[PDB]
Amino acid sequence: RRILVVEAEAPIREMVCFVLEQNGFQPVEAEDYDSAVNQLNEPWPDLILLEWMLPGGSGIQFIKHLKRESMTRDIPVVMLTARGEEEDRVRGLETGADDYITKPFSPKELVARIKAVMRRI
Numbered sequence: 001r002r003i004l005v006v007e008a009e010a011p012i013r014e015m016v017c018f019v020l021e022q023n024g025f026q027p028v029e030a031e032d033y034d035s036a037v038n039q040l041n042e043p044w045p046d047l048i049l050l051e052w053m054l055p056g057g058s059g060i061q062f063i064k065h066l067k068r069e070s071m072t073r074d075i076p077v078v079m080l081t082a083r084g085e086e087e088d089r090v091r092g093l094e095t096g097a098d099d100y101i102t103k104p105f106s107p108k109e110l111v112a113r114i115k116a117v118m119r120r121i
Contacts, residue, residue, distance in 0.1 A: 001118065004045035006030040007080060008055050012103065016049065019107045025114070033057035037065070040072055047118060050097070051080045052090050063096040076117040 003025050005016045013029045020027040028045070030036035033056030039045065048066075052059050059079065066072040079097035081087040087102040098117050101109060 001025050001046045001114075002043060003027045003114065004030060004036060004039055004048045006032075006036045006048060006054055007051040008032065008053070016110065019110055020114075023111055031055070033062060036062070040066075044071065045075060047114060048075060048077045049080055049101075049114075050077050051082075052086065053082060059090075059097075060093070060095050067096075074121065076121065078113055078117060 003020055005013050005020075005027050007013050007016065007029075008031055010031075013031075017027040017029065028039065030039055033054055036048070036050075036054070050059055050062060054062075063077055066075060066077065076098040077096075078099045078101055079090060079095060081090055081100065081102045084102050087100055090097075091100065099113050101113050
């Protein structure tokens with residue numbers, strides 16, 4: 001599955017990509033909002049992992065943007081946060097994300113979350 005990993009920190013993206021490739025997914029990287037937007041075209045991501053604090057714009061507007069076109073409307077988005085305190089706050093904001101994972105995360109939790117959202121699509 002093509003997983004778009006949107007996160008500022010190279011070593012974090014790389015840890016994510018490693019876990020995903022070891023598990024048979026096809027991860028690709030975006031370091032900021034515009035890079036992610038530029039990859040909303042063929043080949044389309046099947047799921048997006050989105051850092052809440054991503055440089056370059058708002059995670060709320062990023063998610064609303066996906067809903068603007070039927071093509072991207074149904075792509076699951078898992079929000080990545082920088083620890084549980086931020087996760088609770090972002091849960092509170094009703095951002096429209098499909099699920100949430102906080103950093104640092106285990107390989108088990110990363111795969112479990114991605115699998116769960118993809119299974120219910």
